[PDB]
Amino acid sequence: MAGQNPNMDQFEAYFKRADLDGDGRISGAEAVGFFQGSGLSKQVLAQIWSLSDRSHSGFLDRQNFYNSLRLVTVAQSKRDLTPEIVNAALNTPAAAKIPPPKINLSA
Ligand SMILES: [Ca+2]
Prior knowledge:
Elements: H1 6-18, E1 26-27, H2 28-35, H3 42-52, E2 59-60, H4 62-76, H5 83-90
Antiparallel strand pairs: 1-2
Helix pairs in contact: 1-4, 3-4, 4-5
The structure holds calcium ion.
């Protein structure tokens, strides 16, 4: 890969958008407020956070957040973020195949 894979451009941009204060960490409020644009249910939005905030830091690192977006697209793909699905979305080759989710921002 040449680093800048099509999806990753937006994966980053979503991070850049989610990080409201721009300190480089996605705070939960920043995350949740961003994921409001995803069009997913509050349980899912909460869940994606929990699934991405694996360090339990209360902030998503760029990497955590890059995972988070994959999970979003999974729910976007009309799936349920089940243990296997979450693992599927993050911990398999297919995770790289996952596009950036529909985040209603100003587009
Ligand atoms: Ca922040």
